[PDB]
Each structure stands twice: as structure tokens, then as C-alpha cells.
Design a protein around this nucleic acid. Structure first.
Ligand SMILES: [Mg+2]
Ligand SMILES: [Mg+2]
Ligand SMILES: [Mg+2]
Ligand SMILES: [Mg+2]
Ligand SMILES: [Mg+2]
Ligand SMILES: [Mg+2]
Ligand SMILES: [Mg+2]
Ligand SMILES: [Mg+2]
Ligand SMILES: [Mg+2]
Ligand SMILES: [Mg+2]
Ligand SMILES: [Mg+2]
Ligand SMILES: [Mg+2]
Ligand SMILES: [Mg+2]
Ligand SMILES: [Mg+2]
Ligand SMILES: [Mg+2]
Lengths: 149, 224, 72, 129, 144, 125
RNA sequence: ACAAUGCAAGGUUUGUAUUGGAAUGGUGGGAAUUUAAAACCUUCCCAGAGUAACAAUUGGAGGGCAAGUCUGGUGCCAGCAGCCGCGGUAAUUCCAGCUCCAAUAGCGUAUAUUAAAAUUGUUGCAGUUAAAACGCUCGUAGUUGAAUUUCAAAGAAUCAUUCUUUUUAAAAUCCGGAUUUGUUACUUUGAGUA
RNA sequence: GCUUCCUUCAGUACCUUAUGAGAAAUCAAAGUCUUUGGGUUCU
């Protein structure tokens, strides 16, 4: 684990066969449409994937549709400006900051806030290095709260 | 010189049931009596005799309620000067007695050391075959094989041991306290021992086994 | 030139002062069950004996021959 | 974390040899590692090995002949010129008569002797005895 | 892990640590600090010429019991006062209370030698005649 | 300016000056071949030693490397000329196998002693 | 140096005290030459060793470390001793004499330096307790960074191996044939260096 | 539904055992180290 002393290995591990299984009836177009609908309804990539797995009969959008789900969202144009994980981190940070504002003496929270900030800065940096974030994007503790939306 | 042999191997060796000490080495047998070793290296019959030396007589004190109580550790290296080296230790009250004990110990120890070659094989092996390294206590020594004309580059004690072993040409190292002579000697011995137990591209061959003295002559031992 | 003995299991090859290491000898059968004259042989190094894998090694060796039949 | 897969693999192999295993599961296969293994096989030290393809970094399992004394990586893959080789080999491997010092060389990976024969030295991966 | 970095491009760290650490080596520090030239009577030299100021005794280290015969001399070079032990069975009297003595080290760089407490110097010539020669006596006699 | 007439030490000292065995060996050598010091022995060792070093270096190179064939060959030839090897033992692995006796044999005094002329080594000298 | 006897030891020969003829530099003087002129070098001719006075020293002999528990003197004094130590009336250590040992026309002492030093550690140190893991985490530079992209295949020579030849895709170029295809590190050949 | 037993994850101790280590005390890490180079910070 990047920050704790946590060393767990709980993980999804996908099956050997990566051409979709026989029982999968859904044609790709339908699944794409479903994905789009889910996106519209406010769900994030991971969440969307989960929904697809559970509510509909489909293991992996990658086996049914050549593309992964983020890619298809992008194609359809409903991709977030601000990437999933990063966004989540930002939200968490914001929450922490609110708590701090409320409740000044919380040392552990402060420590954890610092850690989350650091992680954001890593993630943020990575995104900048690609082209998902713009280069003009620092993350600010003052702004942050407004950013998430 | 006659002695009533106790052990089976010894008994066998008493008569001409064994060719060489090589055979006994092969089947990893525990040599108990120094008499066996003597029999294998006599001045008559045999070629190279066992030249010995008292490399160190260190005095060693126990400190009882009434003063000190000195014993003498003797170390001895024993050596064919060609294949077989041995290293004995004995702590005893008198010096001479200790020395005597140590020679017996050395004989018991006596090991075959593989001499090999540097570069390419010409007449008769001379150095160690590969870098062999023993440790005993702090002192760890790394004999490295050398070309022919080199002598034993190494400490006096190491030179002494190596001549006995029958290595002519070598390169010594020595990490650790070499002033502690006994340990150094032990390390050297260990290194020498390692020479057979190394497993070179030479020895990939799976040659079928020889029969041990104990099965090949079991019938002859039933008489006694 | 004494060529030392190769542990039949692990091939480690075993020196003079090993002891420990053993040349176990297995006697053959001739149709009836009676002791045939011949003897099939395995040297086992000291290390394996110390470990306790020796028995396993022996079993494997037997399997490789025909002497016993289960492997593990 | 991983850094040099190959080094780790070699360490594992060495450990296996020490124990006196027979089989050994080298856990992330790598082209380089495979090449190394092949080389080893060629010079007799290793038996068969069944590079098992997952759908990821593969696993190898490798069949051992009880024959390796040590095998190793020498990290910092030092560039090594053809003249500079001899000293390096003296430093490393136990005898001039045997052992092999494996270079990655612009003519694929090969041992020091091979390199000498060719003419090109290159970067030095590892070795065995 | 080793402790040290063994990267291919690591050289800067490797050099730099060594450069800093060298200074922990006592001998190296003695060689390369500038205080050598400052804080040393001979001022980086084998010998030095000093006129004598006082023939003096120095009591030895506790186990041994002697009064070692020293000569407190002033270096002409440096204006430094130093005790220099004089060898010989009876070689204090071979020198005068004011004689141009040529004094060497004792054998241990600065570090003091043997029974003597803090006398780091061995007079080895008086009025240009060799102390050793005088001691032998068959060779020479002190000119004055 | 300084002259350019460069000059060189012919003999290295021992290292360990009161090793018994070595000393005894040296003395024996002196006895046998009528030599004045240990210096002579040292000089001859040095002479031998350079050659040996060269041989070693050559052996580190492979056969049909130009240097090895040329320089090595030259060395061998020189040895032959000197009376160190002769017919049987001219292969570059052999020039390592030279010892001090081999070299001392070819000293003039030794030769003189051999080929009648004088009753002794000392006499010959 | 050599040979005689005398003496010695060894399984007749080596070794070592009397003699005594041979050898020869050195040293002295002439030349020949050398050299700008001399001087040396070498060269020849006269001179020319037996205590071959034509005289080997230097530093050591407790250990480290080769060599004395030899003789007198000193008496925790003087002194020696790089270090450990020696000296308090047997000093194997001082001061001597004798004998021995080493290196020897050299041999000591000092200061510096290299090696010894894997005691600065790239090769190559150590860090529970010996000196040494920052109280802890984050963190910039720094160093380090999973796997993945043409794998392979066949023929001839040699003593399972070595060295060689041939083809297995795509694009541009040339009259179905034939021939170019990321950058740098790295490496190989060169070139050019007093 | 809880409980046990099996296997397995992540903690986390202990016991025997080291042809493993160590100067030893001891250490499943202090092991895979003169058969010395996985990475890296500090001393
Ligand atoms: Mg981290
Ligand atoms: Mg993990
Ligand atoms: Mg001028
Ligand atoms: Mg001595
Ligand atoms: Mg002195
Ligand atoms: Mg006396
Ligand atoms: Mg005396
Ligand atoms: Mg140094
Ligand atoms: Mg060194
Ligand atoms: Mg250290
Ligand atoms: Mg501490
Ligand atoms: Mg800590
Ligand atoms: Mg960084
Ligand atoms: Mg990679
Ligand atoms: Mg290391």
C-alpha cells in the first residue's frame, strides 16, 4: 500500500478466456447504449462497470465490446473533465478540510489530509503528464471544493 | 607394526583387502584408528611419506580456585605433499603428549584435496581447481588458482599447509583475524576439503557406483 | 584420481568426510519373490537426510526404477 | 518493488538448487530471462522448462539437474568493452576453465567466450558456475 | 540491499559520500587538514635545529621507573619550545646548556614514544657532531 | 637540462625479510651456483619474473590473437636462445615452468664449472 | 682461488688447521688511444699481495623476526624498548667482551607517501548486542523502475558441440528479378593524435 | 441464523529445526555474503 503499512492483496483477477463466453447474448451496440444511459444517470466508470456486472448479464465490457468503458464514454463524449480516482481523492480532501475547519484539534485527520493531498499531487501530476488534466491545474485547498462538480 | 584392530574397516585394512585410501574416501567411511593411515603411508612400499609439523603450541589456562591450570593446545598439519592433507588439534597437560595426540587427530582428519589447473592442462596438476573458500570463526580464506611458476602467494602458515596438501601454486586471501592461527588453519582445511565437493563440468557424468568394503568383503568379516 | 560419489537423488556429489550420506542397497526379486543375486543401489547425500526429504527422494528413485509404485 | 525480474528469478533458482528441489517456479517470465535460461540449458546446467503463458507476465517452471553451484545477476549492467572483459571474468567466476559470464551484446545474449570469439563486448547480465 | 546505491547513473552519490566520509579516517585527516603546518613544531619537516634552553629530567610512565633525560630546546626555524629526549647511556652531559642541537622525530610521527610522557623528539646532533658518534666515542669527540 | 639516459632497477627486495624457509632456499642457491649476495638471486628472480608475467599476460589472450602469436612467439624464441627450453618444451605454457635453477644454469660461471675449466664454482668465478 | 699433508665428520668423499706454488685486480709510473686540450674509459709494457695490515661495514641476537636463557659489570639506577616489554643482585632486553644472524659497499635513523588498509570498501567493509538505522511519516531533486512489439525455421562442414549459407512478413526504390526502413546511450571497427 | 472443523487471505506472536547465518549471545531474519552486485535513503 502506497501510504499505510497495509500489505493486503485483495483483488479482482480476470479469467483466462478473454473472448466473451458463449452464454453472453447481448450485442455490443445494446451494451454501449446501456453504458451511456448509466453514465447519464450520474454513475462513474467503476460504478457503471459494477452495475453492468450485477444488474445486466455481462462480466467485462472489454470482452463484449473491443473497447474499455472509459474509452467508450470518451467516444460518446460524456467523459468527465476530471478523472474518476482523482475526483474521488479531491472529494475526500475537501471533506477532510471541512472537518479541520470545524474541528481544529484533530491531529490524525490533519496527518491523513496531508497524505491525501500528496496522493492527489502524484495522481494530478500523472494526469498532467498525459493530457487528461490541463497543465494549468494545481489543485488548491481554497478552490478544491468548487472543482469536484 | 602389529595392532589388534577394533573397527571393521581397520580389520579389513590389516590384511590386503583394500587397495588405496582412495577407496575408503570414496565410500565416506569413518576412519577411527590412525594405524590405518600409517599403514597406507609407510616409508617402504608407498611413494610419498606423511611429513608432519607442529605449526603452533598455544598454552591455554583454566584458572581454578588454586591458581592457573595450563594445558597446551598443539596444532599439527600432516601431509603427503601430494593429494592428502590433515589438520589435528589436541589439548593436553604436557607438550609432547599434546603433540602426539594432535598427530593422531591429524591422521584421522586426513582428506584428499583435488589439485587442478590454471588455463589449460599440461603435465600434472598443481594449483587448486577453482577458487575455494573456507571459513572458520572470523577468518575466511579464498585460495585462488594460479599459473605454474607462481609459488604459494600467501601467509607463512598458509604456505606450510598448502605444501603439505600438495598444492604448489596459489593465491591466498584472508578476511578476518589470521593472527588466531588455529582458526586460520581450520579455514584452510575447510577450503581444501571443498575442492572435491565442488561439481565442475568435468563431473556431470553419472558413473555407476563402486561396491563398499562392507558388502564386497562381508564374507571375510564373518570369520573373525 | 578418486572420482567422488554423486548423490543419486540431488546430484550434489559427496566428499570423504561427509559420513551421514549413505549408500542404501536394495535387493532384487526373481519371479517367486526369493532374493535374486543382484542389487540396485542409491547413494543419498547427508543434506537430504538432515532435511528429512531423504525418504521422499528414495521413493522417487524407486518410482524411476520399478522397485516401488506410488511416487508422491 | 520488482526492478530486475531477472535477478529475482536467478536468486530463486539458486535457492532451489541449494535446497535440492527439481522443479522451481520462476514467477515473472521475461524475454531476457527466457534467453538466459536457454543459454544455461545449452551449456547443460538446466533441464527443460515450461514457460506457462497466463494472460499476463508468464510464469516459468524450470527443471533442474542438480548441477548449478551458483547462478547470479551482476546488477549495474556495466557496459563492458572487449578488452575489459578478462579482468571482470577473473574477478567473478571461479576458474578460467569453467563457469560462464553472460553478456547482453548487440548480437544477442551470449557468454564471455562467445563474445571474445565474435569481437563485441556489451552489457554484463550475470553468471553461473 | 547493500547500503550503497548501485545504480548505473549513481556515481555522484557514490563519490560524494566517499568525499565526506574520508574525513572520518584519522590518518587521512592528519594528512589533509591545514592545521598540520600551523600546529607542529617542525612545520612539516624531518628535523629541526634548536638551541638548548634547559637540560631536564622527565619521570617515566607508572609501571616503569626512570627519569629520562630530556632537553627543552627552542627551534630556530619556528621559535617553538619542545622537549627532546636525548639517547645514550650518558649523553645528556655530552651536550652543553646552550648548544645548537639538531632534533628529529622519535619514530611515531607526532605520537609520543614508549615510557616517555609527551616528548615527541629525539636530539640527534650537537654542534654538528653526531650524538650516536659521541656515544660510540671511538668515532668522534665533541668539538668546541 | 637533465640527460635522457634512462635507468632502471634490476632487482626488487623480498617483502618479508626474515622468513626462514625462503632464506634457507636462497642460501642453498648461493651455495650451489657460487653467488655473492642475495642481490644476485633477487636480480635473477626479477629477470625470470618479468618473463613469467609476460607469459601470463599472453595466456590471458586467446590463440590467433595477433598480439599473442607475435609477442608470445618472440618471447618463446628468446627463451630458446637463452637456453631455457630447447626442443621439447616450447609452447608458452612451459615458459611459466621456469625456475631459478634453469636461469642460474646459464650464468657464465656455472657454464665454466660444467665444461671442465675449473675444479669448482667459486674457482670458475 | 687452488692443491698437498694435519684434523674433522659422512656413507672412500665433502668439510676445516699447517704449509706453497699458480691467478689477479687494486695502487704507483710510462706509453697507445681518448679529447677542442686534458682527465676518465678501455689497451699494452714496466713496477706490484700472504696476517693477500690491499685489514667490511651497518644494525641486531626475549617476542614480533634470522640470530645466545654465552662471560663479566649494573641493580626499578643508568639505560634500552617503533609495539609487548626488560632493569627491584643468574638481566637471553641495560653497559660491555666473545660468539652468532641479516643485508652487505653499503646499512641505520627521521618526516612524508604507496602498499600492507576489504582500516574509506566501484570491485569491496560495517550498522540487534562491538562505532553506526534519522522518533515517525510525507516529500523535491537524486537513484531505481513489471511484462509486452520478428519469435523462429531449414541445409553444408567439425569433434552432444563449433563456424558458415539460405528464407519468413510490409513499404519505398531499380530493369517477374534486385536493392533502403525511428533517435541517443551502449558496443565494434576505424580515422586523427609529439 | 450462530458454532465448530478444512482451506485461504492480511495481521500477529511462539515452538523445534537448520550441510543457513553469525564473533558468539542468538536470528525463519541477523538467512539466499570472499559461490561477495534486486532497488534505495541514512549512519
Ligand atoms: Mg512511499
Ligand atoms: Mg505485495
Ligand atoms: Mg647550462
Ligand atoms: Mg627467532
Ligand atoms: Mg630503535
Ligand atoms: Mg649476565
Ligand atoms: Mg649484548
Ligand atoms: Mg594506505
Ligand atoms: Mg587490496
Ligand atoms: Mg571495519
Ligand atoms: Mg552500539
Ligand atoms: Mg528506527
Ligand atoms: Mg522523486
Ligand atoms: Mg523492462
Ligand atoms: Mg558485500
Amino acid at each position: 500500500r502506497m501510504y499505510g503499512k497495509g500489505k493486503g492483496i485483495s483483488s479482482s483477477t480476470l479469467p483466462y478466456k478473454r473472448k466473451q463466453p458463449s452464454w453472453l447474448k447481448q450485442k455490443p451496440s445494446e451494451i454501449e447504449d446501456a453504458i451511456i444511459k448509466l453514465a447519464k444517470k450520474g454513475q462513474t466508470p467503476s460504478q457503471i462497470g459494477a452495475t453492468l456486472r450485477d444488474n445486466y448479464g455481462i462480466p467485462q465490457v472489454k470482452s463484449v465490446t473491443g473497447n474499455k468503458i472509459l474509452r467508450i464514454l470518451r467516444a460518446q463524449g460524456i467523459a468527465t473533465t476530471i478523472p474518476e480516482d482523482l475526483y474521488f481523492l479531491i472529494k475526500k480532501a475537501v471533506s477532510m478540510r471541512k472537518h479541520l475547519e470545524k474541528n481544529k484539534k484533530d491531529k490524525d485527520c490533519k496527518f491523513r489530509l496531508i497524505l491525501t493531498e500528496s496522493k492527489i499531487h502524484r495522481i494530478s501530476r500523472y494526469y498532467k503528464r498525459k493530457k487528461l488534466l490541463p497543465s494549468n491545474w494545481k489543485y488548491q485547498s481554497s478552490t478544491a471544493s468548487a472543482l469536484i462538480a | 607394526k602389529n595392532w589388534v584392530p577394533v573397527t571393521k574397516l581397520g580389520r579389513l585394512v590389516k590384511e590386503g583387502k583394500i587397495v588405496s585410501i582412495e577407496e575408503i574416501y570414496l565410500h565416506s567411511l569413518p576412519i577411527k584408528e590412525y594405524q590405518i593411515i600409517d599403514y597406507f603411508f609407510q616409508p617402504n612400499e608407498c611413494s610419498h611419506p606423511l611429513k608432519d609439523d607442529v605449526v603452533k603450541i598455544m598454552p591455554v589456562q583454566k584458572q581454578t580456585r588454586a591458581g592457573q591450570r595450563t594445558r597446551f593446545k598443539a596444532f599439527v598439519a600432516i601431509g603427503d605433499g601430494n593429494g592428502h592433507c590433515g589438520l589435528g588439534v589436541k589439548c593436553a597437560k604436557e607438550v609432547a603428549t599434546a603433540i602426539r595426540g594432535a598427530i593422531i587427530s591429524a591422521k584421522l582428519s586426513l582428506i584428499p584435496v583435488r589439485r587442478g589447473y590454471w588455463g589449460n592442462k599440461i603435465g600434472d596438476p598443481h594449483t587448486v581447481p577453482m577458487k575455494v573458500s573456507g571459513k572458520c570463526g572470523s577468518v575466511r580464506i579464498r585460495l585462488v588458482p594460479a599459473p605454474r611458476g607462481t609459488q604459494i602467494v600467501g601467509a607463512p602458515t598458509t604456505k606450510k599447509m598448502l605444501n603439505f596438501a600438495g598444492i604448489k601454486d596459489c593465491f591466498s586471501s584472508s578476511c578476518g583475524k589470521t593472527k588466531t592461527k588455529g582458526n586460520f588453519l581450520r579455514a584452510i582445511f575447510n577450503a581444501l576439503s571443498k575442492t572435491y565437493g565442488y561439481l565442475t563440468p568435468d563431473l556431470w557424468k553419472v558413473t555407476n557406483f563402486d561396491k563398499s568394503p562392507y558388502e564386497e568383503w562381508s564374507d571375510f568379516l564373518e570369520t573373525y | 584420481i578418486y572420482i567422488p560419489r554423486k548423490c543419486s537423488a540431488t546430484s550434489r556429489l559427496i566428499p570423504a568426510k561427509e559420513h551421514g550420506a549413505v549408500q542404501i542397497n536394495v535387493g532384487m526379486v526373481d519371479a517367486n519373490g526369493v532374493y535374486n543375486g543382484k542389487t540396485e543401489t542409491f547413494a543419498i547425500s547427508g543434506h537430504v537426510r538432515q532435511n528429512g526429504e531423504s525418504d521422499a527422494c528414495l521413493n522417487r528413485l524407486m518410482y524411476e526404477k520399478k522397485l516401488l509404485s506410488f511416487q508422491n | 518493488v520488482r526492478m530486475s525480474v531477472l535477478a529475482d528469478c536467478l536468486k530463486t533458482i539458486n535457492n532451489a538448487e541449494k535446497r535440492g528441489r527439481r522443479q522451481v517456479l520462476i514467477r515473472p517470465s521475461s524475454k531476457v530471462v527466457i534467453k538466459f535460461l536457454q543459454y544455461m540449458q545449452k551449456k547443460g546446467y538446466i533441464g527443460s522448462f515450461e514457460i506457462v503463458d497466463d494472460h499476463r507476465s508468464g510464469k516459468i517452471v524450470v527443471n533442474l539437474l542438480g548441477r548449478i553451484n551458483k547462478c547470479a545477476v551482476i546488477s549495474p549492467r556495466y557496459d563492458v568493452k572487449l578488452d575489459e572483459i578478462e579482468k571482470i571474468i577473473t574477478s567473478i567466476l571461479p576458474s578460467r576453465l569453467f563457469g560462464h559470464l553472460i553478456l547482453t551484446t548487440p548480437y544477442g545474449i551470449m557468454d564471455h567466450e562467445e563474445a571474445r570469439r565474435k569481437h563485441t563486448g556489451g552489457k554484463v547480465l550475470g553468471f553461473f558456475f | 540491499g547493500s547500503g550503497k546505491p548501485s545504480g548505473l547513473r549513481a556515481a555522484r552519490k557514490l563519490r560524494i559520500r566517499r568525499r565526506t566520509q574520508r574525513w572520518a579516517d584519522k590518518s587521512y585527516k592528519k594528512s589533509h587538514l591545514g592545521t598540520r603546518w600551523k600546529s607542529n613544531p617542525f612545520r612539516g619537516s624531518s628535523h629541526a635545529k634548536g638551541i638548548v634552553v634547559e637540560k631536564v629530567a622527565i619521570e617515566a610512565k607508572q609501571p616503569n621507573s626512570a627519569y629520562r633525560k630530556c632537553v627543552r630546546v627552542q627551534l630556530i626555524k619556528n621559535g617553538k619550545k619542545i622537549t627532546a629526549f636525548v639517547p645514550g647511556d650518558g649523553c645528556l652531559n655530552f651536550i652543553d646548556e646552550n648548544d645548537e642541537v639538531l632534533v628529529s622525530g622519535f619514530g611515531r610521527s607526532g605520537h609520543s614514544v614508549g615510557d616517555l610522557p609527551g616528548v615527541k623528539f629525539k636530539v640527534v646532533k650537537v654542534a654538528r657532531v653526531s650524538l650516536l658518534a659521541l656515544f660510540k666515542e671511538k668515532k668522534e669527540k665533541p668539538r668546541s | 637540462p637533465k640527460s635522457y639516459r634512462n635507468y632502471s632497477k634490476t632487482a626488487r627486495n623480498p617483502k618479508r625479510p626474515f622468513e626462514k624457509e625462503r632464506l634457507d632456499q636462497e642460501l642453498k642457491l648461493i651455495g650451489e651456483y657460487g653467488l655473492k649476495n642475495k642481490r644476485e638471486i633477487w636480480r635473477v628472480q626479477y629477470l625470470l619474473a618479468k618473463i613469467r608475467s609476460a607469459a601470463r599476460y599472453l595466456l590471458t589472450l586467446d590463440e590467433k590473437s595477433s598480439k599473442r602469436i607475435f609477442q608470445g612467439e618472440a618471447l618463446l624464441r628468446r627463451m630458446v636462445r637463452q637456453g631455457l627450453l630447447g626442443e621439447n618444451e616450447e609452447k608458452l605454457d612451459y615458459v611459466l615452468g621456469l625456475t631459478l635453477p634453469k636461469l642460474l644454469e646459464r650464468r657464465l660461471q656455472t657454464k665454466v664449472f660444467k665444461l671442465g675449466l675449473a675444479k669448482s664454482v667459486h674457482h670458475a668465478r
